[PDB]
Structures are given as structure tokens and as C-alpha cells.
């Protein structure tokens, strides 16, 4: 049996977002109006403060005033609303992923018939057949495409899809893995409550977006263009972090609870979590590495930057994604990777990883799980 020689390499990255742009400055106006909470003036001030300090300037949403008017239960706090949320999510998640995938396949330059595997991640609703099948059907991929459907894995899933793609690409000769992460806030949309600050945080942070990439070992010369190589992939459940990030799919939709200690748990343990991939490459300086950190919120980015003593430019691509699209869960870290390579191509930098050799793709989520991948950039 002939196995491929080289590491799993990202051969293309494509991204998509819904066309409806919602400015964060005036998001509280829209939000309190569609949920019929205009009379909750005090809660609006608190939500305005969360939005102004969220580090987000705009978010793209499938959900509009019209769609929410046609599905009134989604605007209610605890009323039975899973059904219309699913109806929206099940259809929109693979549709958004399709646009990201088309862009990824186009950048790759090779026909879609060469895609042997498909890894799909979403926390935006669940269905049987999954969003993986639905994406495969929409793109017209081979009926024999090997699929890995990652449902409800939260914000670390952008890192999980690459960890899965790593083994699928490296263990199968000629394997070209289509990776797709798509998030639509249909299930998480929560009406504002005086008794649910986590709901206000999520309503201020969560955005819509899809990211797709082609991963494969042994790139074909003068045909495929290598962007990033995956050298190590793994994860870690943080000590004393039980129940830090919980998410439950209920009759009212996806109800989440984030304990106040989440950014602190991440920052106190980040150096230890990065221990194994750092020793693999002989402990390079943190400032000599590129950072594709999941923009969960401004606090997570600020605290990792401060704990590891990173210069302000390291977290810029992560902050730029947060500013432009908010927290798009699984898709976010892949948008960051795309922005890192785009900045590199725009500025004519030595490597695709902003001039740096080694780098990290870090995702965070339920567990508290921190998923990390060590990537090597490609010289340009």
C-alpha cells in the first residue's frame, strides 16, 4: 500500500457570508425592535455597552426583519421555536457552504471530481441526511465521497475539521479533502432577557459565515498552489473547566451558558496547551510565529496576547475577522487563515504566514476544549 509522503497541505481557502449587513453600532436598535423589547430601555443600554465593547463593527446575517416576522417564535425567549429555526438552518447552512466551496474549488483550479473526502462542521442546527450530504449534493461531488459530519462541536470545530482532514489527506494517496465550516445564527438567536446575560453576549457576538478549504498531501507541481502545511494537530480539555461552555439543543433552540471565567481559563492554560507542538519544532519565539486564533470575543484575544507577551500585530488578523464578521463559530479561524495569506500576498511578504515560518490555528469551545494545530507557511 502506497501512502503519501508529505504533510496535509491547505491548497485553497474560500469564504462566504450572507448579503444582509448589520452594523454593530445600531444593532441594539434592530435587535430590540424585532424581538418587541423596545420597552426594556435598561436592558438596551446594557446591550449597547456589550456591542460597543465587542470589537465587532459589522456582522452578516441570513436572519432579517422579514424572516423573523414570518417566524415569530424565534423572537420569543423560551417559547417552542426549534422547528422554524431548523427549517431555516438546515437549508441555509449547506447553501452558504456551497458558495465558500465554489470559491475554494475555483482557487484550487482542479475539477470537483478529484475531491475524495468531505469534512463538514456546523453548530447551526442538525438534520439527517446531514449538511455534508447536502453540500455534496449541491456541488455534485462523486457519490462515493467519504464524509465526516461534525455536528454541534462549537467554536473549536474550525480546528477540528483540519485535524480530521490531516489524517484523511495523509493516509490516502491522491486524497483531496473538501473542508467546510458553515454557521447560520438561526438556532442561537435569543430574545433579550434581564435574566440571561449570556444571551446578550451571544446576541452581540455571533455572526454568520462559511469557510471552505481543500486539504491534500503531496501537491501536484505547477497545478496546485500550497498555502499552509499541517504538521501537528491535537487538543486539550483544560483543568478545572467543567461546565465552562455548555450548549443545549432544546425546544426553544440552542441555549448556551458561558461561565464568566472562560477567557481566564483559556489564558491561564494556553502556554501549557501549546507545549507539545512547540517542542516538536524546538520552542520558537511566540513573536516569530503567525496566529490564527478563534475570535470568540475581544477578552479571549486580549488575554492570550497579554499572557504570552505577543506584540499587537500578531492578533490583528483575528481582530480584523472579529471586526468584519463577528464570531462565526467554526468558520472564524479559517477566515483568519485566509486573511493571514491575503495580507501576505498583498504586502508581498516572504511567507504565506505574514513572513513567519511556524504558526498556530487555535479553536476554543465546550469542555473547555482548546483545539490546536501547528502550521508551516509556504515561501512566496
Amino acid at each position: 500500500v502506497i501512502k503519501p509522503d508529505g504533510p496535509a497541505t491547505i491548497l485553497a481557502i474560500g469564504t462566504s457570508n450572507p448579503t444582509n449587513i448589520f452594523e454593530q453600532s445600531t444593532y441594539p436598535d434592530f435587535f430590540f425592535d424585532v424581538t418587541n423589547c423596545n420597552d426594556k430601555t435598561e436592558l438596551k443600554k446594557k446591550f449597547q455597552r456589550i456591542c460597543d465593547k465587542s470589537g465587532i463593527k459589522k456582522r452578516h446575517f441570513h436572519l432579517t426583519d422579514e424572516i423573523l416576522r414570518k417566524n415569530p417564535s424565534i423572537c420569543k425567549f423560551k417559547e417552542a421555536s426549534l422547528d422554524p429555526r431548523q427549517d431555516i438552518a438546515v437549508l441555509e447552512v449547506p447553501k452558504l457552504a456551497k458558495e465558500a466551496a465554489i470559491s475554494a474549488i475555483k482557487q484550487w483550479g482542479q475539477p470537483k471530481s478529484k475531491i475524495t473526502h468531505l469534512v463538514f462542521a456546523t453548530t447551526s442546527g442538525v438534520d439527517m441526511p446531514g449538511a455534508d450530504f447536502q453540500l455534496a449534493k449541491l456541488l455534485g461531488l462523486r457519490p462515493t465521497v467519504k464524509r465526516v459530519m461534525l455536528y454541534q462541536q462549537g467554536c473549536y470545530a474550525g480546528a477540528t475539521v483540519l485535524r480530521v482532514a490531516k489524517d484523511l489527506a495523509e493516509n490516502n494517496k491522491g486524497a483531496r479533502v473538501l473542508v467546510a465550516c458553515s454557521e447560520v445564527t438561526a438556532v442561537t438567536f435569543r430574545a433579550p432577557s434581564e435574566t440571561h446575560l449570556d444571551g446578550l453576549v451571544g446576541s452581540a457576538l455571533f455572526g454568520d459565515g462559511a469557510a471552505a478549504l481543500i486539504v491534500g498531501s503531496d501537491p501536484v507541481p505547477q497545478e496546485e498552489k500550497p498555502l499552509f502545511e499541517i504538521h501537528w494537530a491535537g487538543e486539550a480539555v483544560l483543568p478545572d473547566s467543567d461546565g465552562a461552555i455548555n450548549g443545549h439543543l432544546r425546544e426553544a433552540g440552542l441555549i448556551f451558558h458561558l461561565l464568566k471565567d472562560v477567557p481566564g481559563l483559556i489564558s491561564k492554560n494556553i502556554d501549557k496547551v501549546l507545549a507539545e507542538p512547540l517542542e516538536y519544532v524546538h520552542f520558537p519565539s511566540y513573536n516569530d510565529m503567525f496566529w490564527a486564533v478563534h475570535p470568540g470575543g475581544p477578552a479571549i484575544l486580549d488575554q492570550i496576547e497579554a499572557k504570552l507577551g505577543l506584540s499587537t500585530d500578531k492578533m490583528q488578523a483575528s481582530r480584523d475577522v472579529l471586526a468584519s464578521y463577528g464570531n462565526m463559530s467554526s468558520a472564524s479561524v479559517l477566515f483568519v487563515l485566509d486573511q493571514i495569506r491575503k495580507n501576505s500576498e498583498e504586502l508581498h511578504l516572504p511567507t504565506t504566514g505574514e513572513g513567519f515560518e511556524w504558526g498556530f490555528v487555535i479553536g476554543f469551545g465546550p469542555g473547555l476544549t482548546v483545539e490546536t494545530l501547528l502550521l508551516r507557511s509556504i515561501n512566496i
Copy 2:
């Protein structure tokens, strides 16, 4: 980078089922009583006929008269019931998997600290953190265990977990993958309706059970005992099978729709689906191979047996699992593999695959997806 030489090998299989045994002969009596449908005498006759022809003699269930009495919404056809179903499923799925895993780890003989990966599959509810985290926590596995959580993949998931474990085991030196499939009928439990024959089929077929296995490449001599080797893994979406098996997680729980043509779609295409792994091993006779076919129902087993011209003993292990535990979705095919090796050890057969060299692990489900793995038995 040193990669392992040999194929992904199943090093142990452990199984579990809830302690409450429900005889299929008298299941209609219990079923119509707990759902308060005793007055639907005509529907009871139809359900009795489905149960008598289901090829199932007994099923193990977590759900009892008492649990259903304490959660009355689960006994209602379309009333909001996802919440109490999830409350039960989220807790019971990893608990049942724990017992299967403990049995698998015990048979393996090596410490649980050596488990580097965890692949978990369930269609019995969804939660964040997933059943994979919950199993890892209950077993006390390393906090750095690499997890692949396969939610809502239906009845082909027993084959999917092995396909995933194949690449994880073969691409990482020293990797020992704990595979766990656990199904608890909490979400699928459906009150009988004159207008939902699919509900009656599922109520007569679906059972509870968990199966766990240790998968790893390059077995350590005189320490680990190889049971089955995985040589090929793949899948196929069947032609003209759109919407054949649909499953939706709604406010009322997991609502499924199975088109009457499901066993026919599987049997008409099975020879073509098996084409790629058969040519890999030079087309051996179907009767010279062992069969670990998912016992979805008696019709699926009968029709594949008749189409491929299999002798009656081939589907026996599959029929025995159906008879003893019913359709336990993802776990079923792994129970079949366990029964194949148990029969082989009991009868002192030449190989672990009932004296045969090559064999198939076939799963079916939403798509219509047919997942197939080619296995080689080990000489005993």
C-alpha cells in the same frame, strides 16, 4: 516523521445494553398501554403483525413504564417533548458507552492512558460538550484525547466510526483509538398513530445498545490480540435514492420518514457498492466471505441475501443480533462483528471471521448512504 506500517486493527470489542428486557411478543401490550392508546385496537393488530414479522425476539431499553410516567410528553405523538428526551439521552448515551468501553479496555489488557483518540457516534440526542467528552470524562482518559464526535449519522455510523478510526490509527504512530457507538431510543420513541406507519416500524425495530472497540495499527506482540484488520473503507450515495431515509430533530423529538423502497434500493445497488473493495482483493466469492451487515430490519437482510445469492448462514450473526437486541442503529454492526468473533472462538474456527478470510462491515442510512469496510480476519 515515522508512520505505522500495518493496517488499522480491531484489538478488542466490548458491548453493553440496558438491563430492562422487553419481549417482542408482548411489546404491543406494553407499548399501547404506556402511550394510552389501548382504545386503538385496530392499530394494535397492525403493530402486533409488524412486531411478529420484525425478526426481533427481545430488545433492551432504558425507557421503562416508570420513566415514561415521569415524562408524559414522550408518550404524546406531536406535543413538545425534545427537552425530557434530551435530558434522558444526554446522560444515558455516554453511561451506556462507558460500560461497553470498560469491557473493551479490559479485553484489550492495556491501560486506558494509552488511548490517544476517541471516535463516538450516536443519533440519540445532541449536546455540547458532546457524548465523546462525556465518555472521556467518565473513563478518565487523558485530557489530550483527540476526539471525533459523530452526531445524528444514523444506522451507517457503526461503519463510519471504523472508517474514521482507520485513518486516525494508520496515520499516527502508537495511536490507540477508542471507538464507541451508543444508542438510547429516548428521542425516537413515538406514540402510535394511524397516520404514521414509519413510526410503528421504528417502534417495532429500534433498540438500545452500545458497542466499543479499540483500533490501532502495528499490534504489540504478546500484549495485544488482533481480531480484525481494516483494509478498505468507503461509502456510496445510492442512485435515485433522494429522501429515502430522512430524520429531523424537532420539538417533538426525532421524527423519521422511511420510503417503502429502502430495502429495494439497497439490494439493487449492493453488488455495485461492493465493486471497489472486491477488486482490491481480486473478487473473492461472496460465500467465501464473512458478513457484518447492519440489521436495519428483516427485509434488508433477506433481500441482500437473495440478490447476492448468499447461503443462509452468512446473515446469521446479523440475524442473531436483530433477534436479541433489535436495531440499535450505529452499535448494531459492531455487535455483529463481536458475535462473528465469539462464534469463531466458541467453534474453534480457523479465523475470527467464521473461518473466512475477507469480509464486509456494511452500514445503511440517510442519503441513502451505504458505508462499507473490507476487513481481513485473523487466524486463530
